[PDB]
Amino acid sequence: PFFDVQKRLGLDLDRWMTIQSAEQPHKIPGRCHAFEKEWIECAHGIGGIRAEKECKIEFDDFVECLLRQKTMKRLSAIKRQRDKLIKEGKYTPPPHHLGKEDPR
Amino acid sequence: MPLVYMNIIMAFAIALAGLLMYRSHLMSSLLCLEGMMLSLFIMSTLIILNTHFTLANMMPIILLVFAACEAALGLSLLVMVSNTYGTDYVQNLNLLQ
Amino acid sequence: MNIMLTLLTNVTLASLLVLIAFWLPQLNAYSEKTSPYECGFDPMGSARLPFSMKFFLVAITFLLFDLEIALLLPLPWASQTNNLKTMLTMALFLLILLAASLAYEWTQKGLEWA
Amino acid sequence: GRIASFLKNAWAKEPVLVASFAIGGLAIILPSLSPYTNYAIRINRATPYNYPVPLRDDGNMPDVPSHPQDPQGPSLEWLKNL
Amino acid sequence: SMMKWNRERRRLQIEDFEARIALMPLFQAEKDRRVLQMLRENLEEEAIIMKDVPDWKVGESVFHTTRWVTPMMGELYGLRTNEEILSATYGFIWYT
Amino acid sequence: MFMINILSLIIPILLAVAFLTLVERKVLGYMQLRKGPNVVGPYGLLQPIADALKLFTKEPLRPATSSISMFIIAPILALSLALTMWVPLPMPYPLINMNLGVLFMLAMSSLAVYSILWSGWASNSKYALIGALRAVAQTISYEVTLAIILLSVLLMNGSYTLSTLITTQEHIWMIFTSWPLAMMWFISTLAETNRAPFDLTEGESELVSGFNVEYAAGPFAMFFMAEYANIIMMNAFTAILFLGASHDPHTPELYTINFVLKTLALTITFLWIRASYPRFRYDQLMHLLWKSFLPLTLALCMWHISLPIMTASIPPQS
Amino acid sequence: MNPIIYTTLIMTVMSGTMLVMISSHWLLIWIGFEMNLLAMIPVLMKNFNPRATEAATKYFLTQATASMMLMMAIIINLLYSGQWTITKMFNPVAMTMMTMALAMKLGLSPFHFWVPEVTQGISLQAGLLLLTWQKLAPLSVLCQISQSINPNLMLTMAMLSILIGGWGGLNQTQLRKIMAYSSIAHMGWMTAVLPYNTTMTILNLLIYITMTLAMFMLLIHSSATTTLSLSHTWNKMPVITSLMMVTLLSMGGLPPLSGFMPKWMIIQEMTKNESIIMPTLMAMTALLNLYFYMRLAYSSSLTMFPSTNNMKMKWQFEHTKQMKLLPTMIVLSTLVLPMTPALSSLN
Amino acid sequence: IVELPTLEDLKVQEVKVSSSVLKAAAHHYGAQCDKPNKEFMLCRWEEKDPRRCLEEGKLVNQCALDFFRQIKRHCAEPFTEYWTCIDYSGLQLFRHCRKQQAKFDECVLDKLGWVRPDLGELSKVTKVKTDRPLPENPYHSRARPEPNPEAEGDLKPAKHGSRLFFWTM
Amino acid sequence: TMYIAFILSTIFVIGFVGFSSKPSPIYGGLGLIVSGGVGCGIVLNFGGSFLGLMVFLIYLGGMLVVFGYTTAMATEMYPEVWVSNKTVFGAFVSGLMMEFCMVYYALKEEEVEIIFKFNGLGDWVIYDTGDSGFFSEEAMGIAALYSYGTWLVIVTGWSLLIGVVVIMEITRGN
């Protein structure tokens, strides 16, 4: 019985702690504030059920925001690719002594 | 998910299997439970550190509190069971599993 | 790094002192010399059960204060929050309960320590 | 009347505890009285860990200064006088 | 006395906050250009390395989203020397 | 070359605990009218190394009844942490700038006594077990009040970082502000370190050298040594934390020249306590704490929570 | 323990459940159970017996491990969706564990083994309270996570709770253990329909609580325990045995009686879902559940076991300390059948 | 496939003064250089994409360069006398030096002639005019899916009510 | 890189291997000490230093001591070392082979097939820019507990208090 007395009385005593955004001290951003914000703005009158259909893309991008799962599978695929080229390729000289220290 | 998290989760799975293999005097179980508690703590805190989901920086410590709190209770019961025997799980009065 | 390095040098230092402590005098250990001390006369029995309720009856209270001070720690930083009146009650509040808890123990004669 | 009398008693008996209740309660009642408290919170409004992001002009407004230091924003030398 | 000295130190603090707060924006600019720089460079190195792969859209954003992300500081140091990575992440915490 | 800095932190301190022993017998001697060690010196000075050599040379038996692993690992931990607590200590410049190293001082101090628990557990002897147990009682019983009063004196410096604690004492000293907490800190350092009136871990006549008994030569030297590490160290800690000093950055050395005075001035006092009071007994030892120290620590604590708001005197550090 | 403290404990249990029924944030729910536990153990320890102690040991040990698995599964949920609101869970490997943790909290089989034992270890006061008030909170959260439940996993425990709630009920003599198997059996019926339609669950819940209040108030009124001890009561205060008969039949769900209202709404709901076989097996086994209510009725009211002589003096002395709430708890738990439609009040 | 600026187009000669030296005079730097600066950050927090505001991010660099070019020809020896005092402390604390700031701030307030801002001044938010449009949808985002109708009329009594099973009314 | 955080996770897990095996509570107390310091180290690596020092203080500096009291009340003559029984030692080895299989899976560099996928590679990769003013995220993050989160403070206060009451109402009964 999800009594929601805190809502009817408006106490909000619990609600603040919820969600990545929702006002945080010194306005420190969440790491994934944006995808979350979009995804919640997508979510209202649609309510729960249809929401798992239509807002799926937003939640997806939010997922990758959280875990960085796919970008890791990619980046792993590249770094593992590079070993094959390690004898066939010498990569990049600057990493070692380029303008990156001049860069700032 | 990065391998480290998988490792801590596995430490949880061991921290449970140890509780349930469950043997001899039960004080070991309060240990294993507290270990379980610690694994959940660490697994939480790494996350709240991850996404800079700052408010939740408060939770792990609060988690810790109650969890430690119940364990703090647990010893007391052991005392009582220790009080009449010199503890062992092997001795239980109740019937019908 | 920094700290791990000093940890390693300290522990290795101590362990070094241990090894030069044992593998050095180079003399004769033997039985009865190695028997446990008991102010002369032999022990009536190996250490068993120095049971006391008066141990946990307070020691548990230690544990439940230590959890409390764990909540007290955020205070110095919390003091600089933008809205102290929202805070200040709580800053007092827990301490009252801390005291209150103690007070409850104080006079249910649950604090016989020793 | 008589209730004052056993303060002499407790003060004779458990002085430590007496001083404890004394300052312990006084620390709770006192703070509301002090005016400085209103300044005290105010100081922590003044200090900005985060950057003050500029707002776009849109027809006067006009209390927001358009920098340099237009005397339109909050005064802070009141604090300087402290 | 503690009151006097403490307040005064609060004043010099807030002034220090104006100092940093004045420094900030161009650092924002620098970190900006430097990030886009490293991202470009690593992307080119991708164009070289992954080119051998028959099927590999290069530099594709994993997201459907058009919007910029500020890359996780993992891919941004996707090929850098280990020392540079030690400077990258742990470098603060391991610093005294 | 950070390593040679560390080595430069560890050798001088061990030398300091040795000569601390000698000073102990000296002053504690002259309180007794009798002169302390003297004949071997000429001023006794050569003594402690002769002492240590007497120990390490002497055979350190592995007890037949004792489990060996715990029995060896405990001393190691004792010297370990006894030394490790020294690292983040601003003299003036800390070897490490921990953001919150005070709290770390508490961490090390809190793992300290656990070694005592093993020291008496693996020792297997009756005296070992009983003494170790009461030892752990007094210790924890004092760490709670310990950490609370340390908190309350830290609300006003600003933050847990140590170097700032210099900055916050550029004039008046903390002590004039909150001396009663300094008293309780002092005594809590007088018991946590297991010293004079709060004497029980050693037990002495009460329990013939307490937990420490079954340890023979070297490990005994380790517990002894580590004990003095903690004594000088909590003394230094109190010194920086309740007694500020002038500090010109251009001449840091000047400050240290002052600091060792202000801390040594404390350590001697423990010895001058040792010559003065009979020990408490395990009841009263915990009685005065739970009944009497603690409530004041709380009332003072709310008071110190409340000054910065009423005084509008909130310390700077973010 | 003086009443002034006892009442604070019991009120903080009430609070420790109300908190679960209020808060939307998960952490406050786990706090809700957690506070509930600490305040639940001591009340089992009043009077205090060498037996009662290990009773509480059982209860604590299982509730603690349950709460642990629950918090773990919450944390995993957060890891894979970064949320704290109840709502849907977003990772089945986590979701099944939240289902398990709650499965211990209800005492559903095969997690059930602690409940018959624990009941044995405590007085009928603490017993009744354990079998009613403790059944609220975990259900209070299951109703909130009905949306995503993995029905297979739920119906399997939901059935097996009914079989085990049956077979383990035919075997025992002393009543408290039987009340334990009754409740452990009804929970199968509550948690069965939960995936399909929560309002039927809450209806069944209300009937169950009313019922077990009727019984435990009666056992209190007669201080019977072992079946034989119950047998004597027909001569002393015939009415109450003559009323245990009825309330038992309402446990049995013989159709004019109120206790039939649960099953007969449940069968409706599941039947809309097709799923026609499951309620048939379920309803057939509920019979097996009935049978030991009947045998227990035979020990008591329908037939007179021989009285002991010593009873006679006890005839002079009226029972005292009347429990006001009782008569209504009988009547609501029986006669209310032509007031099913009112169930829609629960929407 | 993501759009990126060419490796060159971003390139600009860096400010390369050290951070301590930078800080020694930055307190004036905020006071003088400004319009490009706030234009920049306001431009940044608008659309979040850095590339959009990268050009202003150039303009601020060159502006700061002109600032130091104005510096070096005049105050310098007093200036170096100042930041050398400051760089000596690893806390970079202003309190440690200060007196030199008398030298520096005076030589500037006379020889190049303009005041140091007071401690309570830079923090305040500033009004800033700008010609470029505020972005349509900075998050880009998508459509907001059509909300369920909140349709309503009025409640006529239930057609026979409680229609479940045998109940009539 | 060093993978130092990860190898710390490994020592952590074996800390639970020797701990979850059940060879006298005292040695298990050692197990939680080792796993404790390893724990605070691991969480320290992300820089949530205050928390790692909470556990290194509040937990290990509190708990395992009070367990160093329970064993005084329990003990029994001849407590068993890990080597002192075939099921205990068998259990410890049983943990070691499994966790070692996990490390071998780390050598495989493939995503873990167990339970659910573990993405692999080094820990550093997930980090993002930690940019901030003169304050750590953690500091104000927990400081928020008082001003900005009074409710939790209420229920924790109430809970711990009545927990003390419960300890009373258990021990006094004897």
Residue D55 has phi, psi (to 5 degrees) of -105, 140
Distance CA I41, CA C1 (A): 13
Query: Under a CB-based contact definition with an 8 Å cutoff, are residues G131 and G92 in contact?
Result: no
Distance CA E23, CA E27 (A): 7
Contact at CB, I68 and F121, closer than 8 angstroms: yes
State the chains in contact with F (3 or more Cβ–Cβ pairs under 8 Å): C, D, E, H, I
Query: Under a CB-based contact definition with an 8 Å cutoff, are residues E24 and D51 in contact?
Result: yes
Distance CA G216, CA G325 (A): 12
Domain range for C74 is 1-108
Q: Count the neighbouring beta carbons within 10 Å of the beta carbon of residue H42.
A: 22
Q: Count the neighbouring beta carbons within 10 Å of the beta carbon of residue G325.
A: 8
Distance CA H30, CA H9 (A): 27
E-I interface: how many C-beta pairs under 8 angstroms? 34
What are G272's two structure tokens?
């809309």
Residue H128 has phi, psi (to 5 degrees) of -145, 120
Nearest alpha-carbon partner for B96 in G292, G127, G115, G110 = G115
Nearest C-alpha of chain G: how many angstroms from B52?
11
Query: Under a CB-based contact definition with an 8 Å cutoff, are residues B21 and B82 in contact?
Result: no
Q: Which of residues 69-88 of C touch B (CB under 8 A)?
A: 70-71
Listed by start position, the domains of chain B span 3-92
State the chains in contact with B (3 or more Cβ–Cβ pairs under 8 Å): A, C, G, I
Contact at CB, A89 and E49, closer than 8 angstroms: yes
Contact at CB, D37 and F309, closer than 8 angstroms: yes
Nearest C-alpha of chain E: how many angstroms from A54?
14
Among D47, D80, D82, beta carbon nearest to E17: D47
The residue among I112, I132, I151 with the most chain A CBs within 10 A of its CB, best to mutate, is I151
**Interchain CB contact of C81 with D (< 8 Å):** yes
How distant, in Å, are the alpha carbons of C9, F8, F10, F19, F98 from that of F5? 12, 5, 9, 22, 17
Cβ contacts of B76 on chain C, cutoff 8 Å: 56, 60
C-alpha neighbours within 13 Å on the C-beta side of residue I132: 20
Cβ contacts of I48 on chain E, cutoff 8 Å: none
Contact at CB, A14 and I151, closer than 8 angstroms: yes
Q: Which residues, 6 or more positions from A34, have their beta carbon under 8 angstroms from its beta carbon?
A: A65, E67, H48, H139
Nearest C-alpha of chain D: how many angstroms from A27?
8
| In the block, residue with structure tokens 């496939």 | H1
Among A17, A26, A76, beta carbon nearest to I120: A76
**In degrees to the nearest 10, what's the CA dihedral of G233, G236, G239, G244?**
-10
Nearest alpha-carbon partner for E52 in A72, A87, A81, A71 = A81
How distant, in Å, are the alpha carbons of F122, G99, G150, G302 from that of G91? 48, 12, 11, 55
End-to-end CA distance of chain F: 33
Distance CA G212, CA G220 (A): 12
Contact at CB, B54 and I119, closer than 8 angstroms: no
Nearest alpha-carbon partner for G341 in I137, H123, F43, H164 = H164
**Interchain CB contact of D22 with F (< 8 Å):** yes
Does any domain span residue C114?
Answer: no
The CATH number of the domain holding residue I20 is 1.20.120.1200
Among B65, B72, B82, beta carbon nearest to C60: B72
Q: Which of residues 171-190 of F touch C (CB under 8 A)?
A: none
The residue among I4, I16, I17, I32 with the most chain B CBs within 10 A of its CB, best to mutate, is I16
F312: left (phi over 0), alpha (psi -120 to 50) or beta: left
Does any domain span residue C84?
Answer: yes
| Helical spans, DSSP H, in B1-97 | 3-21, 27-50, 59-85
The residue among I156, I161, I167, I169 with the most chain G CBs within 10 A of its CB, best to mutate, is I169
Contact at CB, B76 and C49, closer than 8 angstroms: no
Three-state secondary structure call for residue H129: coil
Cβ contacts of C56 on chain B, cutoff 8 Å: 75-76, 79
Nearest alpha-carbon partner for G245 in G180, G293, G177 = G293
**Interchain CB contact of A73 with I (< 8 Å):** yes
| Helical spans, DSSP H, in F122-251 | 126-154, 163-167, 174-192, 218-242
Measured on CA atoms in the order G161, G167, G171, G173, is the torsion positive or negative?
A: positive
Nearest alpha-carbon partner for I142 in G332, C76, F181 = C76
Estimate to the nearest angstrom the gap between the alpha carbon of F179 and the chain centroid: 19
Domain range for I97 is 4-172
Distance CA B92, CA I126 (A): 50
Contact at CB, E89 and I47, closer than 8 angstroms: no
Distance CA B31, CA F63 (A): 29
Nearest alpha-carbon partner for G191 in G131, G252, G127, G141 = G141
Find the farthest-apart pair of alpha carbons in chain G and give their distance in angstroms, rounded: 70
Pick the CATH number of B3-92 from 1.10.390.10, 3.10.50.40, 1.10.287.3510, 1.10.287.110: 1.10.287.3510
Distance CA C78, CA C88 (A): 10
The CATH number of the domain holding residue C46 is 1.20.58.1610
Among B36, B43, B84, beta carbon nearest to G75: B43
Query: Under a CB-based contact definition with an 8 Å cutoff, are residues F48 and F256 in contact?
Result: no
Q: Which residues, 6 or more positions from H122, have their beta carbon under 8 angstroms from its beta carbon?
A: D69, E18, E21, E22, H30, H31
Contact at CB, D68 and H128, closer than 8 angstroms: no
How distant, in Å, are the alpha carbons of A31, D16, F98, F233, I52 from that of F149? 37, 16, 21, 18, 22
Distance CA G184, CA G31 (A): 25
Contact at CB, C93 and I58, closer than 8 angstroms: no
Measured on CA atoms in the order G223, G229, G234, G235, is the torsion positive or negative?
A: negative
What are F61's two structure tokens?
């038996």
Among H49, H54, H95, beta carbon nearest to E12: H95
Q: Count the neighbouring beta carbons within 10 Å of the beta carbon of residue A24.
A: 24
Nearest C-alpha of chain C: how many angstroms from I57?
9
Residues of B contacting chain G (CB within 8 angstroms): 1, 5, 9, 12, 16, 19-20, 26, 29, 33, 36-37, 40, 43-44, 47, 51, 53, 56, 59, 62-63, 66-67, 69-70, 73-74, 77-78, 80-81, 84, 92-97
Q: Count the neighbouring beta carbons within 10 Å of the beta carbon of residue E17.
A: 21
How distant, in Å, are the alpha carbons of F134, F199, G294 from that of F274? 20, 9, 80
Q: What is the CA radius of gyration of chain B?
A: 17
**In degrees to the nearest 10, what's the CA dihedral of I117, I118, I119, I124?**
160
Name the domain count of chain C: 1
Name the domain count of chain I: 1
Nearest alpha-carbon partner for E56 in I31, I137, F263, A81 = A81
Query: Under a CB-based contact definition with an 8 Å cutoff, are residues B3 and I12 in contact?
Result: no
Distance CA D37, CA D46 (A): 15
Among F7, F80, F154, beta carbon nearest to C14: F80
What are C97's two structure tokens?
């309960």
Nearest alpha-carbon partner for A78 in E83, H1, E74, B50 = E74
Three-state secondary structure call for residue F227: helix
Q: Which of residues 67-126 of H touch E (CB under 8 A)?
A: 93-95, 117, 119-123
Nearest alpha-carbon partner for F125 in C36, C62, I131 = C36
Find the farthest-apart pair of alpha carbons in chain F and give their distance in angstroms, rounded: 65
